[PDB]
Amino acid sequence: MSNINLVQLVRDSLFTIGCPPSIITDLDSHSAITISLDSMPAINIALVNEQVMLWANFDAPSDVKLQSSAYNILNLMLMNFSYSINELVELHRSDEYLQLRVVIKDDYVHDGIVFAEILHEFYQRMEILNGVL
Amino acid sequence: MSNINLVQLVRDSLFTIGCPPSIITDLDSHSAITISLDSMPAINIALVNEQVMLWANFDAPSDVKLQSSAYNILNLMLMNFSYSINELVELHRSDEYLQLRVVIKDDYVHDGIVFAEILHEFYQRMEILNGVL
Ligand SMILES: [Cl-]
Ligand SMILES: [Cl-]
Ligand SMILES: [Cl-]
Numbered sequence: 001m002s003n004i005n006l007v008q009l010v011r012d013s014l015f016t017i018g019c020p021p022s023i024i025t026d027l028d029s030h031s032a033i034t035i036s037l038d039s040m041p042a043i044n045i046a047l048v049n050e051q052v053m054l055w056a057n058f059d060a061p062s063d064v065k066l067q068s069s070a071y072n073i074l075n076l077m078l079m080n081f082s083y084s085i086n087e088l089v090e091l092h093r094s095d096e097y098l099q100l101r102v103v104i105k106d107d108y109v110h111d112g113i114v115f116a117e118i119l120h121e122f123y124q125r126m127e128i129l130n131g132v133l
Numbered sequence: 134m135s136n137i138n139l140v141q142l143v144r145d146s147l148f149t150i151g152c153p154p155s156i157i158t159d160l161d162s163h164s165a166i167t168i169s170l171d172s173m174p175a176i177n178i179a180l181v182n183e184q185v186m187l188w189a190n191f192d193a194p195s196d197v198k199l200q201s202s203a204y205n206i207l208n209l210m211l212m213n214f215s216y217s218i219n220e221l222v223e224l225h226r227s228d229e230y231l232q233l234r235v236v237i238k239d240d241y242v243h244d245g246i247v248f249a250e251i252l253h254e255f256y257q258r259m260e261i262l263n264g265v266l
């Protein structure tokens with residue numbers, strides 16, 4: 001009914017990573033949470049169908065850029081992600097963005113220390129994608 | 134419970150596609166169903182946690198083959214698939230295979246005519262992957 005517990009989870013996770021809660025923002029008690037990052041798209045976190053979803057919107061690359069970076073991107077996408085409901089991080093393409101998305105299993109969203117590791121790994125996947133875009 | 138309703142769904146779908154229910158095989162009433170195809174991996178279909186999953190196992194390509202085919206595989210994986218729970222067909226490393234996998238939304242597994250289109254599109258994606266491996 002509210003994002004209050006998700007906000008607290010993210011906050012708790014950031015104490016463990018070593019970042020301040022000043023980078024965490026939201027619109028209201030029902031919106032997605034945003035973690036602003038330097039030189040990278042923000043990490044968005046929200047409850048979608050009672051499941052925690054993390055996503056990042058990268059500016060969509062041209063077809064030719066995707067071609068020169070395809071091997072690197074494919075290898076990234078084939079990497080298992082243990083906390084995901086399907087064991088993977090997903091890539092969704094729209095006209096404007098190439099979006100990295102993952103839906104986390106309920107087993108891992110009730111412990112800020114574990115969620116810190118999830119955020120850290122998602123950030124690492126984002127770093128790899130950012131480096132080849 | 135059992136794969137009886139799923140077997141009936143699959144065989145019904147095949148009549149609509151123009152194939153016989155002879156290409157449909159299974160081990161018993163609790164196993165996955167397998168549709169044998171000529172010159173391509175079989176299509177596997179099973180109920181996994183009350184959800185219908187389709188998957189096909191392709192022999193995993195070497196690293197050098199992946200380098201040349203990465204762009205085509207990536208383009209394929211970014212294609213929307215409307216019947217999937219995440220709007221995509223998934224690609225997983227699975228033992229010695231590259232596996233195409235999709236979990237179908239419950240909305241589309243009670244009508245053999247609709248499921249026929251699902252099988253047809255999954256087969257089309259398999260054809261695309263097969264052509265670059
Ligand atoms: Cl939560
Ligand atoms: Cl982070
Ligand atoms: Cl069913």
Ligand SMILES: [Cl-]
Pocket residue numbers: 150252253256
């Ligand atoms: Cl078919």
